[PDB]
Amino acid sequence: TPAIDLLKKQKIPFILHTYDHDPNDEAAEKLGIDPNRSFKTLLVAENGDQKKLACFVLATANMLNLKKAAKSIGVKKVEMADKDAAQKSTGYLVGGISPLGQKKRVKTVINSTALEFETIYVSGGKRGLSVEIAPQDLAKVLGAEFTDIVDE
Ligand SMILES: [Hg+2]
């Protein structure tokens, strides 16, 4: 996947994990990972403008707090990204969105809680693949910030 191609291109350390998706947080479950360490990637539209997207990385069970997410990227509000817009920007399908290897470069924020782990798991860009990566290495590849963007 373009996620794996980017890491290899940039020589970023990572571990590839594979599990069997059966077509019809799967990664935490099937890899026996603590859920706090398994991160999803969600896109949002800045001020509801669906070609100005931004990317948020957060534990799979956490809910994205759109007020916090807006404030983290310096915009007035954010709304959930259109299923279609997200796909054309990322090149990935929902349930397989990697923060890595996206087609379009956008701003990226990682939830702060990521920093309490040595490594975290993010989608490898296809169901059944997970990338394990140091949070600071993920941030360096994406020019990402660490900020509080969740509820609870
Ligand atoms: Hg991203």
Q: Where are the domains of the chain?
A: 1-152
DSSP state of 116: G
C-alpha of residue 101 to centroid of ligand 1, in Å: 8
Resolution (A): 1.8
C-alpha of residue 56 to centroid of ligand 1, in Å: 7
From CA 127, how far away is CA 121, in angstroms rounded? 13
Task: Report the candidate in 128, 90, 78 with the shortest Cα–Cα distance to residue 2.
Answer: 90
Task: Determine the distance from the C-alpha atom of residue 87 to the mean position of all C-alpha atoms in its chain, rounded to a whole number.
Answer: 13
C-alpha of residue 102 to centroid of ligand 1, in Å: 6
CATH level 2 (architecture), domain 1-152: Alpha-Beta Complex (3.90)
Q: Kindly give, in sequence order, each residue whose CB lies less than 8 Å from that of residue 52, ignoring residues fewer than 6 positions away.
A: 45, 46
> Read out DSSP for 7-60?
HHHHT---EEEE-------HHHHHHT--GGGBEEEEEEEETT-TTSEEEEEEET
Region at 103 (left for phi over 0; alpha for psi -120 to 50; beta for the rest): alpha
C-alpha of residue 99 to centroid of ligand 1, in Å: 4
C-alpha of residue 78 to centroid of ligand 1, in Å: 16
Task: Report the candidate in 129, 143, 146, 110 with the shortest Cα–Cα distance to residue 14.
Answer: 129
C-alpha of residue 144 to centroid of ligand 1, in Å: 8
Note whether 104 and 89 are within 8 A (CB).
Answer: yes
The experimental method behind these coordinates is: X-ray
C-alpha of residue 94 to centroid of ligand 1, in Å: 13
For 48, phi and psi rounded to 5 degrees? 80, 5
CA-to-CA separations, 120 to 12, 58, 142, in angstroms, rounded: 14, 10, 15
C-alpha of residue 120 to centroid of ligand 1, in Å: 15
